[PDB]
Structure formats: structure tokens, C-alpha cells
Design an enzyme around this catalytic site. Structure first.
Site, PDB file in Angstrom:
ATOM      1  CD  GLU A  35      -2.877  -1.408  -0.072  1.00  0.00           C
ATOM      2  OE1 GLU A  35      -2.206  -2.106  -1.157  1.00  0.00           O
ATOM      3  OE2 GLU A  35      -3.901  -1.105  -0.303  1.00  0.00           O
ATOM      4  CD  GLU A  66      -3.968   2.017  -2.972  1.00  0.00           C
ATOM      5  OE1 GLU A  66      -4.028   1.504  -1.976  1.00  0.00           O
ATOM      6  OE2 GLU A  66      -4.702   1.867  -4.096  1.00  0.00           O
ATOM      7  CG  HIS A  69      -6.497   0.889   1.110  1.00  0.00           C
ATOM      8  ND1 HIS A  69      -6.325   0.467  -0.246  1.00  0.00           N
ATOM      9  CD2 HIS A  69      -7.464   1.400   1.525  1.00  0.00           C
ATOM     10  CE1 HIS A  69      -7.590   0.794  -0.511  1.00  0.00           C
ATOM     11  NE2 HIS A  69      -8.408   1.356   0.314  1.00  0.00           N
ATOM     12  CD  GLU A 148      -4.612  -0.809  -7.160  1.00  0.00           C
ATOM     13  OE1 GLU A 148      -5.136  -1.590  -6.293  1.00  0.00           O
ATOM     14  OE2 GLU A 148      -4.099   0.346  -6.625  1.00  0.00           O
ATOM     15  CD  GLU A 178      -5.757  -4.951  -3.323  1.00  0.00           C
ATOM     16  OE1 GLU A 178      -5.989  -6.167  -3.508  1.00  0.00           O
ATOM     17  OE2 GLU A 178      -4.877  -4.747  -2.526  1.00  0.00           O
ATOM     18  CG  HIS A 181      -7.731   1.174  -6.781  1.00  0.00           C
ATOM     19  ND1 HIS A 181      -7.072   1.211  -5.556  1.00  0.00           N
ATOM     20  CD2 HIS A 181      -9.244   1.837  -6.671  1.00  0.00           C
ATOM     21  CE1 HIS A 181      -7.916   1.843  -4.692  1.00  0.00           C
ATOM     22  NE2 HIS A 181      -8.785   2.415  -5.249  1.00  0.00           N
TER      23      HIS A 181
END
Ligand SMILES: [Ca+2]
Ligand SMILES: [Ca+2]
Ligand SMILES: [Ca+2]
Ligand SMILES: [Ca+2]
Ligand SMILES: [Ca+2]
Ligand SMILES: [Ca+2]
Ligand SMILES: [Mn+3]
Ligand SMILES: [Mn+3]
Ligand SMILES: [Mn+3]
Ligand SMILES: [Mn+3]
Ligand SMILES: [Mn+3]
Ligand SMILES: [Mn+3]
Ligand SMILES: [Mn+3]
Ligand SMILES: [Mn+3]
Ligand SMILES: [Mn+3]
Ligand SMILES: [Mn+3]
Ligand SMILES: [Mn+3]
Ligand SMILES: [Mn+3]
Ligand code: NA
Ligand code: NA
Ligand SMILES: [O]
Ligand SMILES: [O]
Ligand SMILES: [O]
Ligand SMILES: [O]
Ligand SMILES: [O]
Ligand SMILES: [O]
Lengths: 266, 266, 266, 266, 266, 266
Positions: A35, A66, A69, A148, A178, A181
Site C-alpha cells: 500500500e 491508498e 489502506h 494493483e 483493487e 483500481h
């Protein structure tokens, strides 16, 4: 500029502690494709873009996500390290904890007080060499898809490395983000390829030595790759195939250096 | 097993020396996206594959080719470093060489005797953190496309960083080979996506939290990314858009550590 | 110049072998805040000082002492590794040693022949990025206090990671030396702050934008930091508090680069 | 979770381009004591704290602010790199640009397309080894003061490395914020010292070998440090001074290793 | 334990300042084969030895001496950085200094206040990966000779990189010490080879596949190495020569991994 | 240029799986003295040589051979990782596997899908700092002998770390090849020493301060090294011995730096 809320984007709490899983999740925090790599890559690319706002804003949107995350994984690791064994008192309570201790990151306890590091599971520090921001978003959107993809592969593996439903809930969210993304970056990539070309960079076709641009060169003696021969490449031209690649550049003969270098080579 | 011929794959000799260009070309030798990265990535992936020979052979074919490129760049740098200035005698010959010296990598002379390093232009050592081999070729073919895309971008830049037609001859060949490599890896990628899925890995759709898988989340206040709203993603489902992403995971509250850790936090 | 005696500064022999403790002690040898960091920081600062002999001599005294500690840790690790298990023959005489083997650093046997490395417990090499020598001793004495603080924290943790009285004897000596070092560097720091100022560096108050120098800016939505509002800072001025920090710098707009860079950004 | 606005916290635009200053400012972005170190240290400590909200929130407030500074430095570098020379056509326009090119980071153009890297001025990647989060905030607040001290030193030096008033405007802002950050962390540190002790960690006084805790040991032959003799240390006890430190630990002898290690040492 | 005197082992003062030479000399301080490598290698090996005192003492003698050399280089660099240019005031004084500035290490001024770093000339941090201590002194004495060989080569090059008679005086002393160190390590090496064998380790001749132990395998198509054919090797046996080495190991096939790894390889 | 055959140079298949041994063998693949170090050192030296063909061809022959060894170790690791435990399903099957899992590299599964990495056993990335190519083959052939010595020592150790006769068969071949490589490099070294001199570089004897070139300096108080006194060194001159080395360089005094540096040192 940024602002922070203490509320996590999504649940990052395990049902129970597991310091071995904590160590694994260091991959998602401080690892090559974790991340922090996403955060720094997307932010840096976003800050560097002078082009279409569609993509500049996508990058800053995603890099900011991110960071959430990074916060989530750091938090999960902290929960997972609760009550982890680290010394004789723990072994006296339960000698079988030696196995757990052996599999832990020694630095989780010693360096961090049973908190997350910014290293991968092997203690290798996250570093900026993991980040790409080239100035060319055809290339970098491809990179973002890769980030990703490798990340989602790792999260998918992590899912099969625990049975903790709390850990899994967090992983299931990350799998979904993900997917989003991967998809958004693929759409950007495709739009950029349509604008600039399928080959990166798209404005060098007249410069390259074209005769070698579509030839698959058979450097290893397997013949699996001959299956590409005659297939249509993404630019509309077919691949040709060269069974025996040739050495065309001659034998080099570099000049001996100045005596002051003491290059004694026989 | 490998065998070697002294003959270069293609010309790697410049028309004139230029130690500043030698330094730039270290990017292609020891840099993040350079030929050593390609060589080690494609060979490691190739050796790791237990799958289709079409792709295993492609990777070993290409990794082996990249070793020829490593050789070429190393050779070009050696030629470019001929007669490079490194001390007072050179400045006695031409005081303007101080400018050249200032722009050189000090270690080219001092460490290597005016020969190539395995570092980037700034002396950062090539390292395996640049390499990806994950076991999943849908992911790794994407990575391979990226490798060849970033490399070709750099080679394209290098072409505009010299007027030496010998240097450019080599670059023009590498541009072409990188075209081929981009295309062949894209074909492999597409075939693998057709088999396993467009999302990596392709067998987790029923596990992920689907509700968040197609939502563009607006974390930065620009509105450029709203253009993705309603576009059809590569998996056939449209993107939705959330102007104000929500923090859904609560405020974390981790248990303080054992007193033996001395985690004095107030 | 230095001279060496074979006699250790203080006892560094464990009562019994323990290769897991050996691995932990690698933190004190090759780790971020270990003895090598102290040695190299204090000696580099000491060699760099052109100022008061009180401090220059203190740094060289301490750096020289830290070399003795590097020697002690290296020695202790060597003793702790005595008779450590590393292969099938060891398990034959005691099968319970598998757990020990699993927790050991594989390189202790394989690379070093059951001797110390200069890595941390995770195998990460000590590096000079851990060292600070800035030329400013107000800053660097603060760093030195931190080095001794982090080190003493780690030693304190190590004390709870073994019950070996020989190991603990050495650790108790190191705890005491780290107390002295914390205190001597705190005294130096305070004298330097009195001479140059509490803010580092102390000669820029008229240059900085004063209106922002005492404002606590609330970037995270927790309200804990509001407790600093109205408290008197160390320079005698009260902190103010800004609940909602403002973005004052505008939206940047960097110029697109020259086409030779191929910065295709949409 | 975080959110982002495109507006910078404070102005980050130079009056004129200057790629040499761009390279210097890489220290503030990707260097040891730069804004990324601040951001990651304060956020990681903040996420890891289970203690008083006054300090947890302070850390999260400040780490979030440092992300704004990362953004500002990245932006400033981008502006500073505008129109920077990178190839022969620039030299054709003005041959004197060779001096500028010699001083630039080659990767600014080649790798990043005349945008910021996440490296220091020498191309060394930022890495997590620069970050401390120990679990003990007495130690870590000391670290945070150091971070802000070393940073402010570097910003103060940078002020004397340019005459650009746009660059200086940014620097003046950062000086002020670093003042505030130094001060707030010093206040936190002092409150925590009152609660836990001036020696870190504060709960080991009965464990350490007290006889060695307040002795200044004269390991280097200079006599400057004798000035500490008799001074009252911060814990209220005077320093004593030992002109001739003694080696108390004997000459160690580790057992020769097993023959399977092949430790042939004579 | 160690003690320090402020007196340098040998002169380390230049006649004049030269910040470019300062940067070169960082190779000798913080570089791969520099004095810190010598110091840490010889001390770590010395502490590790359980064998003959002749060699253990030699290693501790020399490692201790190398610390003197670390001090000397650090000192020389400080002197060489006196009055070095780093900002607009210097360029106002002498505009020609732009060249010097371009060739300097930006961190010498910015980070260290015109003092030495513990990096190489390219700002790469010294790291323990440069050190070898294996437990076998036949191997390690070979390494020590290499360390002193590579070092003396670099010092020899440095001698041709300046005309400063003070710098040269230091270099001439180091050349001589490196001669002594090469020789003493060669003598130790030879004595150890006489005891244990010329092949390292010397006690595996009956384990290895002897058939392949003296065959020169011609993997590259040049024929220069055929000159070894029939020459007597150091163990008294002649080299044989194989013009066309054979691949004897078969084509490997590893088993596809568990689907939980998502190893999608086609 | 290179070409590849899928056939391995020699057997690289173990009789059975063993993920702990896989982890150990990562030292031979990605470690300091492993096969990648040989490959890259010998190839780079080969490409950089402008000297006698005998040596240039030897280096290219051997570096090409090392690539086969890289392939072998990679392959062996892959086989050894078959069926390795990595998650709860494995523990459900056989709870005893927790010991094995504790000793594994977490990244073998998580990052690589139970395939080899290019790291050492501790996850430290292979890097080019492990490679030497100096331009002087007297020095570099010494280095090459060291590489093969350290490698053969590690392979010898590995032999005693398994009972798998398939693994041992591979190790036995490598032991033999390392014998040949040690010997061929020793022969090259000796020829080169005869040509250029036993001291590297051989053309500096009249420059060095000869009075210090054969003096053994007793910096550590053990007297074992006095045994070298009077022995004839390899260049034909006897060693002398200095019981009490003298500090001859005076006490340095560097000039305080420009106030713009803020070097506040008291
Ligand atoms: Ca093929
Ligand atoms: Ca947006
Ligand atoms: Ca707050
Ligand atoms: Ca003293
Ligand atoms: Ca040959
Ligand atoms: Ca001695
Ligand atoms: Mn994410
Ligand atoms: Mn993502
Ligand atoms: Mn290529
Ligand atoms: Mn390619
Ligand atoms: Mn200490
Ligand atoms: Mn200390
Ligand atoms: Mn800041
Ligand atoms: Mn700050
Ligand atoms: Mn030396
Ligand atoms: Mn020496
Ligand atoms: Mn080999
Ligand atoms: Mn070999
Ligand atoms: Na906890
Ligand atoms: Na100075
Ligand atoms: O994500
Ligand atoms: O390529
Ligand atoms: O210490
Ligand atoms: O800041
Ligand atoms: O030396
Ligand atoms: O080898």
C-alpha cells in the site's frame, strides 16, 4: 493539502491475535507491491501530471485512498500483535509459544513494542526504488495496473493464510478496491493508448530500426514461442519468427585506458 | 544452460567518446527499469513457470536476449569512457574538461578504471527489489509490458540526449526490440486474461465485497475523475462514482502492550 | 589514533548458549539504534567538531567507548552461538532442537560459521543511513540523546527476553552506561541551547514567517491536541490552536515538459 | 481515513526555474531527515499509540501536515525543473548550460521527465530505515524533536543556497512550522518525562548497575570532558569522572565450532 | 576495549582546499573497499577467531590500525571542504566556482555542514554487505588481501587525481601501509593454505565430483582460455580443457502449486 | 551474445521437498557470495577487459557458466518448495507443520508462489554492491579466487545441512566446479603477479613511503603477531615489528565553517 479522520475507511480489526499473520501483512504495508508503494506512486504521478484532469485527479483520488489502506494495514498489524509472545514469561505460561516466537519478526517486539514496522516480512525497509513516476502516463498507467494486480494477488494469497473472519473481512474489502483500481487504471491506459499509441512512447516508430520490431527471436531452445508466429500483434502487424537469432554487432575492442588508472589486465 | 559468443547481438559502438552519455546509459545497465531488470525478471519467471510452454519459452527466449542487451550497454559504456578526464593531467591538456569531470560519475574512474558499473547514473546499486516474479503470469506479463514500456521510454529519451550516430544506431535497435517485446508480452497477457480473467487473480470474484468493486471514490477534490462515471469497465460492468467517500471502519483502539515492553505513551 | 586491549570493558559471557538470544542481540550490534550507530555517530561528530573541546572530547570519549560495546556484543553473540544446531547431526542427538533451528538466523551458521554478523536480527545490513553528523551540535546532541534513549529501551526489552544471568549482567552494565550517556548528552544539549537558542538553529527567528511559528494545526479530527492551547512553550510564548487549518498556497500548475521527454499525460 | 484538496497548504512556487536548487530540495523530499521521514514517523507513531489522546492526536495532526509538506516540496521541485537543459539541442541554444547540466541529477530528466524523485540529491532512495516508531513516546518525542531540528537546520541552509524569493517564501513558512513542531514535541516530551522519568525507560533504575550510571569515562586523551565533573545531571545526581577507564571483562575465548562448519582458523 | 589519542597516526592535512577531491576521498571512507570496510572486516574476523593467536592478533592489530585510517580520511575530507562553495554568496565572490559546485556532493554542505559523510562519492551509504567474516581464515585472509589490493589500487588512482603535496603525503603513507597489509595477509594466507589445503575448504576432496574439478569449460567462443590446457594447477594437477561443455542435468519440471497461490501460468 | 538450452548443466533436482533447505539455498542464489555475484562479477570484468585474451576469455567462460549455476539453484529451490506449508489448510492437515512454516521465508509463498526469490535467506535483495570489477585483474583475479572460496565454503556447509542425496549430488558438482574455478583464477593471478608485481598495483613502489611498507604495527596488546617479525614477505623483504606504534600526524584543527551553515558547536 490533506486532512485526516480517525475513522478507518473500512474495518481493520481481527477476531483474534495472530503475530504470524501480522508478519505476513507487513508485505502489504512495507513490501514491494504494498500500500505504501501505491500511495507514493499514485501521489507522485498525480503531483507530476500537467495533463488531462481526468487522469491527474484519478491519481490523486487513488493515492489518497491508498493512504487509508496504509492506515488500515498498520492498524490490523497492531491488533494482530496483541499479547504476542516475546520472552521467558510467555514461555513459562505456555512452552508451545516457542513455535510462534520462532516464526515472528524479532523486531516487532524489540524495536517497535509490538507494533507495525515499515518493512516487509523479512525486515527489508520499504524504499522509493519500488515507486515509478516517469512523466509518461501511458507507461505509468500500465505500471499502476501492475501494482494493483500484484497487490491483489498478494491479498488473495493472504486470504488463504488465515481463517480469521475479521482479517478476511478487511481482505475482502481490499480485493474489491483493487478490482476497481485495476479497472479504472486499465480504462485510463486504454484511452491513453488510443491517443498516443499502443507502443510506448508512441512517437518513435520512424526512428526505430523497423526490420526488428515484429520478430520473435528464439534465444532458448524450447519451441513454445513459435506459436506466436503469424499471430496479429496489437498494432495490427503479424509476428514473424527467427529460429536462429544472429549476432550482428561484431566483437568489441575497447581501448586500454590511461596508465594512471593502473588497469593491469595482462 | 547458456553459451556465449563474443559477437554482440547488434552494434554497440559510438562514433566518439562521451563520459556524460556513459553516465546516462548506466540507467539502462543498472537502473530500475534497465536491461538487468529485464534479464533477471524474465529468466526468474521463466524458470518458475510450470505452465504453458508458449509463455515459459517466451520468457526464457527474452531473458536470454536481455543478457545480450546487458552486454551491449556495458560495451557501449566502456567505449564512451575512453579517454575520459579524471585528474590534473587532463586539465593541463584542456582546462575546460573540468566541466566534463564535474558531470561524470566519480567512480567510473576511481572504482572501475573507466569501465561500466552495475549502478544507475547516481551510483545506486542495481538490486533485486527491481525484479518481479510472482508465480502468476497474468500479473507478471503485465509487469513485463511495463518493464519494456519504461525501458523504451528511457531509450527514447536517451536518443534525444546525444547526437552520436553510433550511439543512436544502438538505441534504434533497442527501440525496435522493445517494440517487439512490448507486443509479445501484450499478446501473452491478453491470452492469459482470456483464460483466467481480466481481474488478477481471476478466481476471487465470489469472495471480494462486490459492492465496492466498481465504485470510483473521490478522495481528492478535483472532479476530473467523474468522467469515468458510467463508462463500461473492461469486465463489462459500469463504473459508479462516489463524490464523498465514507469512513466505514470505526475508530481503532488497540490493547496496550505488556509492561515488559516499556511502551510509555501517556 | 586508537589502541586496543584484548580485555573487554565489562563481562560479555552468557551463562549458557542460546542462539535465539544471539539473533536478538544482533539488533544491538547491527541495528538502527545499536552500538555501531553510536560508535560511528559519536566519532564522526567528534572528528567534525571545530568548537568547544568540552563537547568534542565528550564525543570522542563516548564514540571510543561504544567501540568497546561493539566488541562486547560481538563477543556475547559468539558465545551464545556455541554448539548451536544447524544440520541433521544435531537433531539426531536432540530432536527438540528443530524449534530452535526454525528461529535462528540461517546465516549465523552458513555465512559466519556460528559467529556474529553485522546485520540486525532480520539480516538487514547495518548502514550509514543510521548515522547523523550535521555540523550543528544543538541538533546532534539531541540526536545523541535519542540514540541512547532508543538503545536503552531496546536493552531494557532484551532484559525481559532472557533469564540468563550472564546476559543480564552485561545488559545491566549497558543500562547504566546508557544512563550516563543520556545524561551527559542532555547536559551538553542544554548548555548549547543556552548559548544558541532552544530552536535549532537559533539564528533564524527574524527570517521565518512568525505568524505560523506557535500555531498548533489540527489536521486530524481528534481533539486531544487542543490540550496544548494556551500552554507556554519552551521559548516562553504560548501555543495557539487552529481547529481548521487552511490551504493557503493555491492549486499548482506546472508547465508541460519538452516533447523530447515524451511526457504523454493526456 | 484521509481526504485531499488540490490547494497547497502554503505557496510552493519559485520566481524562476533552477534545476540545481531542485536537486538540493530533494533532500527535503527524499532525504534522511526530510518531510517523508516526518510524515511516516509521525503517522506510524500516531497509529501505534494506545496512550493519551493529547499525544496520539498531536502525532496524527503533525504527520498529516507533513503530507502537505511532501506535496509542497514535490511541487516546488517540479516548478524548479521547468525548461531544465538535458540534451545537445539545449547546448546548441546556449553552450554555457553545460555547467548546469553537470550539476543536475541525470535521473530528473531521464527517469522522471523533469519531475521530482523520491530520492535525496544523490539519488539514494528514501527508505524506512529513516523512520522510528518504538512504542515509547518519551523516546519517540525526543526523536520527533530531532527530526524537526535536523530538518530546520537543512531548511536554514537551503535559505542561503538560493536568492529566489519564491523559494524563500516557502522556506520561511517551513521554518516557522518546524519551530512549532520542535516546540510542541518538546512540550510533549517534558510532560511524558514528568510522568515516566528523565531516563528512558524510566522504570529500570533498580535493575541497572548503578555504580556506572553517573561516571564520565575518559576514553579519548583530550581533557575537555573533565568540565562535566561535579556538574549536576538532569536527574539531580552529580557526574563523576574517571580519567583512566578500566577493562573489567577479561579476555574472551569462544569455543571452536563444529568441524562441519570448516572454520579453519589456524 | 579501545583507547583513543587525538594525535593522528600520520599527517592528514592538505595544503589547500579541494571539495572535488573531498568527494573522491569519500570512496576511501564510505566505499565498498574503503577503510571502514577494512576496519569492520578485520575487527569482526579478529573477534570471531578461536584459532591461532598469530592471526587473531594480526587481525585485531590491523583492524585497530584501520580505525586510525578512518579518522585520517575523515579529517582530510574536513580540511578539503574548508571554504567550499555552496550558495549565491560564493558565486558572487567567484562565478567560476559554479563548476566546482556542480562537481561537489550536495550533501557535504547541506547535510553535514561541510564535513565528511559515511557515504561513497555518490552518496551511497556504507553498509555491512561490504564486510566478510566467514569463520574460515583461509578464505578470509584471501578476502583481506583483496581488500588491501582494491584499496591500494584506489589510493594509487587518487594519487593521480591531485597535485596537492599534503594530500599526496597522506596517500604515500597509506600506500605503504597497504603494502604491509597485503604482505602480512599473504603470509598468513600461505601458512594457512599449508595447514589446511590450497582449495577452500581443504577437507572436501573426497566428497566433490572429482571428474569435473580440473576441467576448464569453454562456455564462450573465444579461444584464449585454451592456453590453460596442460598447465599445472597450484595443487599439482594439470588443467584439461573442454571446447564444448555439455548440459547433463535434463529439462526440469516443477509441480504446479496449490490453487490457493493463484499461480496462473497458462 | 548468449543462447540458452532448457537442459541444465548438471542435476538440480532433490530427492524430496524441504522448504527450510530452499531458504538456505537462497544464499547461493541471492547472497553476497552466491552464483549471481559470480555471474555478474566475471561477466562485467570480462566485458571490461582490454588485456590478454587468455584472461578475458576465461572470465567470459566462467561468468557464462555461473549463469547455468544461477539456473540450477533457482530450479532446485523451486523443487524444494513443492508442497510447502503456507496456510491454515496445511495446518489442518498436519499441525506439526507449524515448525516448518516458522522456519520458512514468508515471501516464498506470499510473493513468489512457492518459487525462488533473488534474495538471500533473510530476504535481503541481491545487489551490485556485491560485485567487483576494478579494471585491474591482479586485484580482480584475487577477488575471483575469494568469490569461489567463500562460495565453496558455503556449499561445503550446505552439504552438512541436508541428508538429501539429490541435493548433495548437485552440491558435489558445484564443489568440483568451485575447485576448478579457484584453481584457474589462482593460475591467472600468479601469471599476472609475475607480470605486474606481487603488490597491487605493481608500479607504485617509488612513490609510497617505503619506511612504513614492511613494518608490522602492534595496535592490539596480544603478542601473537610478533611471530611475523623476521619472516620473509612475498616480495623478498623481511617484516620488522613495532611494539608501540606512534601517532605521527599531530592533532588536527579544521577551520570553523561559514556562518551560513549554522555549525553551532560550542
Ligand atoms: Ca524458444
Ligand atoms: Ca477527485
Ligand atoms: Ca486533532
Ligand atoms: Ca577525554
Ligand atoms: Ca572460451
Ligand atoms: Ca598485537
Ligand atoms: Mn490499496
Ligand atoms: Mn489500490
Ligand atoms: Mn532489452
Ligand atoms: Mn526487452
Ligand atoms: Mn553503548
Ligand atoms: Mn552509549
Ligand atoms: Mn514539514
Ligand atoms: Mn514538521
Ligand atoms: Mn588502511
Ligand atoms: Mn590496510
Ligand atoms: Mn558456480
Ligand atoms: Mn564458480
Ligand atoms: Na499491543
Ligand atoms: Na570548515
Ligand atoms: O487499493
Ligand atoms: O529489449
Ligand atoms: O553505551
Ligand atoms: O514541518
Ligand atoms: O591500511
Ligand atoms: O562455480
Amino acid at each position: 493539502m490533506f486532512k485526516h479522520t480517525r475513522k478507518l475507511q473500512y474495518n481493520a480489526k481481527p477476531d483474534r491475535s495472530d503475530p504470524i499473520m501480522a508478519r505476513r501483512l507487513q508485505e502489504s504495508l512495507g513490501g514491494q507491491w504494498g500500500e505504501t508503494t501505491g500511495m507514493m506512486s499514485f501521489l507522485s504521478q498525480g503531483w507530476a501530471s500537467t495533463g488531462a484532469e481526468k487522469y491527474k485527479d484519478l491519481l490523486l483520488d487513488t493515492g489518497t485512498e491508498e493512504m487509508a489502506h496504509v492506515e488500515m494495514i498498520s492498524t490490523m498489524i497492531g491488533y494482530l500483535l496483541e499479547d504476542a509472545p516475546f520472552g521467558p514469561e510467555d514461555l513459562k505460561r505456555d512452552p508451545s509459544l516457542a513455535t510462534t516466537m520462532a516464526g515472528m519478526d524479532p523486531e516487532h517486539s524489540l524495536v517497535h513494542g509490538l507494533n507495525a514496522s515499515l518493512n516487509n516480512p523479512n525486515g527489508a525497509a520499504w524504499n522509493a526504488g519500488y515507486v515509478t513516476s516517469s512523466g509518461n502516463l501511458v507507461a505509468d498507467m500500465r505500471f499502476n495496473v501492475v501494482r494493483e494486480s500484484e497487490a491483489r494477488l498478494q491479498v488473495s494469497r493472504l486470504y488463504s493464510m488465515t481463517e480469521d473472519e475479521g482479517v478476511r473481512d478487511m481482505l475482502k474489502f481490499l480485493l474489491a478496491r483493487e478490482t476497481q483500481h485495476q479497472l479504472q487504471f486499465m480504462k485510463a491506459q486504454e484511452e491513453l493508448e488510443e491517443k498516443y499509441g499502443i507502443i510506448v512512447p508512441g512517437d518513435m516508430k520512424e526512428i526505430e530500426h523497423s526490420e526488428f520490431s515484429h520478430v520473435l527471436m528464439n534465444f532458448s531452445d524450447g519451441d513454445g514461442s513459435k506459436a506466436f508466429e503469424g499471430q496479429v500483434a496489437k498494432d495490427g502487424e503479424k509476428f514473424t519468427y527467427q529460429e536462429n537469432p544472429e549476432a550482428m554487432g561484431g566483437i568489441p575492442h575497447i581501448k586500454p585506458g590511461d596508465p594512471r588508472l593502473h588497469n593491469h589486465q595482462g
